[PDB]
UniProtKB/Swiss-Prot annotation, chains A, B:
Pathway: Carbohydrate degradation; pentose phosphate pathway; D-ribulose 5-phosphate from D-glucose 6-phosphate (oxidative stage): step 1/3. One of its GO terms (molecular function) is NADP binding. It comes from Leuconostoc mesenteroides. Changing P149 to G/V: Strongly decreases catalytic efficiency toward glucose 6-phosphate. This is Glucose-6-phosphate 1-dehydrogenase. The gene is zwf. Homodimer. NADP(+) binds at G12, G13, T14, G15, D16, L17, A18, K19, R46, D85, V86, K148. Changing Y415F: Decreases catalytic efficiency toward glucose 6-phosphate. Keywords: Carbohydrate metabolism, Glucose metabolism, NAD, NADP, Oxidoreductase.
Amino acid sequence: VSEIKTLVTFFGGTGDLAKRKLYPSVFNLYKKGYLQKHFAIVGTARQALNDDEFKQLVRDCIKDFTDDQAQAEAFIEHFSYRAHDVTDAASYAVLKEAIEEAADKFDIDGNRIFYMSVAPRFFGTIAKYLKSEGLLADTGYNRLMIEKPFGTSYDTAAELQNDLENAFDDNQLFRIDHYLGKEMVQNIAALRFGNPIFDAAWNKDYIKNVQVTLSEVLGVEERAGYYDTAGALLDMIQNHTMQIVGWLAMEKPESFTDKDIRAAKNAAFNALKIYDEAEVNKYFVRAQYGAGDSADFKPYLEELDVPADSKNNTFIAGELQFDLPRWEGVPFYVRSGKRLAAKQTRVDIVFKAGTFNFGSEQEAQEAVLSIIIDPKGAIELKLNAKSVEDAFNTRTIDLGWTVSDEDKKNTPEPYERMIHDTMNGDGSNFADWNGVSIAWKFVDAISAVYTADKAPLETYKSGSMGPEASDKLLAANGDAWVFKG
Amino acid sequence: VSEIKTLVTFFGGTGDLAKRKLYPSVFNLYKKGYLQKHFAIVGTARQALNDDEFKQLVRDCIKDFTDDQAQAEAFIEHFSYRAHDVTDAASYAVLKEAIEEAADKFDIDGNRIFYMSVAPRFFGTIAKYLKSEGLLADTGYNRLMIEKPFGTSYDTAAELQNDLENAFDDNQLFRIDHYLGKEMVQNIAALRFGNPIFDAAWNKDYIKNVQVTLSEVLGVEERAGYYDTAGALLDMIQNHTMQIVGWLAMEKPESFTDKDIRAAKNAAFNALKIYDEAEVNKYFVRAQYGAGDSADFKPYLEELDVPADSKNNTFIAGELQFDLPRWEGVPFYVRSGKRLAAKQTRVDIVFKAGTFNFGSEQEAQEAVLSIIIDPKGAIELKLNAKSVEDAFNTRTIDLGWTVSDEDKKNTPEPYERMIHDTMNGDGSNFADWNGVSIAWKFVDAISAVYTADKAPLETYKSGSMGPEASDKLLAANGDAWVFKG
């Protein structure tokens, strides 16, 4: 494989994300051979660490993935560290020098990546300074990887965006959503555009409805401080869920390049219907988990650091609608929540049942294409066939496929994908501004009615699949969730 | 279950088919509760057997199909036997009498089924006398189950047809082909018409070619006497293969009633291209098996009873063409033979590859839907998805399904399915005159050039999938056998 020549600077280089996700990913790119001699990693944070202490930190964080000592040592010598106060303009001069020193040491020509893994208050500030203090390279590329969240409403986001646009063009910005980095999620376009039988049926004439489910068995754990102000709505729906929908609802692109893909996705989002108060009430459900069946499952209000009057949503179920011919009348059902029956990230495409009557007791039911993303990749197709009875009758059978052991071992972890893609300058698995702005516009309309408490807050017992209102939502259209736990 | 009131007479009631399959099947119908009290089975052959030894013959045969010995005995009590010579009109009175006795003893009002399980030469005769000697019931129905509808030649076949329509009404004729009775063959229509995504692609816009394979590992064994003049052409192609093609190539029927199904099938059969001499040479391959790698897999010309000059075909592969708008340009490849790599009856529908450019190393390949009929039922769908590599690329994966233990344990045997259907007077799974007629004309066109030795006789290693001329047939259209052995 060809060598990738880059200089990566991590803001927030001592946080857990960097320690357990980022460095090991970068190390993998090294093992694979993409990273060879012309590369350097400059870590930065507020604590007073130094080069020796940083290399040691890195060494410990990748010890579990090392083949041999020499390999780790060779890798480690490409890192350097600079303590740095993101608000201090002068501090940037120290960083600029570290970067230039590293660029000279390993002969790196531009190609800089700045990874922001710090509190979001600093996103705009760091951006402006990168330009001011002359940290941006004069040749090669300059790219910014921005960690979640990306604002907390359309306003904050737009504001963030405006700030970012001072030193970067939208196509150099890489907003991170690790679900877009999962292998199975990337199989969607292949399945659809690579098989005419599905490609031709990916529209309102064959699809009854689309279902997206991101369910977790865990509760609020120990992140109540942050979660209580975000809820399933901002933590799971606005970002992960919406971006998966984008892959599903997209129009057929001119070609498979990042530019056409985003264009194809943007056309769908532009057709997304934004709701008013009555509609949010009609099409969405918000709930909070109650007690379960064991002394481990406390109702949400009894969790650590959760205010006693909390009206936060730990579960959201809703219907999206697209004003594009392709999707006329096909509801996209979306759901995500904590304390549900199982851990599962999946997509289920329910096809309209056939009208040909066999004159049997059980006529043809709806076929279903299911793509399981988490916990283990699997694809299943529920099809109508003949029952094993004396009189002709139909039944539903499931053809299945699941990742092999070899598939698992060769699957790159999402952060490796993202970093590698950013190095290649491929925007295929990243959302662009148009996509993010629409998601915010859509979600704001919902939040607005929630904060004003203009919609019920349902309960559901820990261990189920949500409030009964969730089922009632699909029932109105003669639909039902295919995954029942 | 409802009790079925019927009287079934078996001509050839001491032959292998009766012993091994007919009797055990009727028994299954009894155990399942369809056959309760108002029923009788009258057997008949040349040999002078008495009620005791005949009942004993049935007992020996359903012995391993009985759980409770009591139900066995209770079943046995409904049988009666009469020695009878089919050619002597006089002895039909003995039969006629026996029939009436059993009818009055068990209170069966008409509803007679006559199963002709004897050599074909006798069918015409038995039919005429059934009407002549007044064996046909007064009230209820009268139905004929003809074991070998094709007869031994188009002429005799046509002749028998003549006799039958001049004495019986067509809805009383049940032309047998046990393959139509196989559970998986009956799933084909359910899969196609029961699923819009498949129903809509069942034509030339999506299908590249259809393959039908009926392979066997055994050689001629101890049937050289019959096989040497029949060959795979008459033994497997003319009958079983053709009936399967029928289910595949049929047009979409108006409804799922046997009348519309037959019309739909016939639209395909009448559109089948019958070949002249040049075309047989172009589209068909005949071959005879040579020695295998192992020891006792000797060449066909060395089997104990095969004449030195034998030019018999133990393998046929060919291309069928239907002149219907939905099948324009799609070849139907058929192959059947002895001493091939494995025992298998299956259909493989190859879909044209998509044309979407992913910009990958491996673009989309052809999807394939496979229906395994023997040894065990299975349905597989090879689809294009994403490979597990750093760069985006496609690969084919296989979604599969196979019959469960419960399914195969509740699956009726072909003969039970057929007898039951005849009782119900349902002709959907039986061959009709037009299909039988066409199959004959089709085959006779091929036999003519073969008996005139105007086409080559290929050789193939026993244990392989046939001569390479079989692969060349498909390669001419850029196709290849999916089943590799």
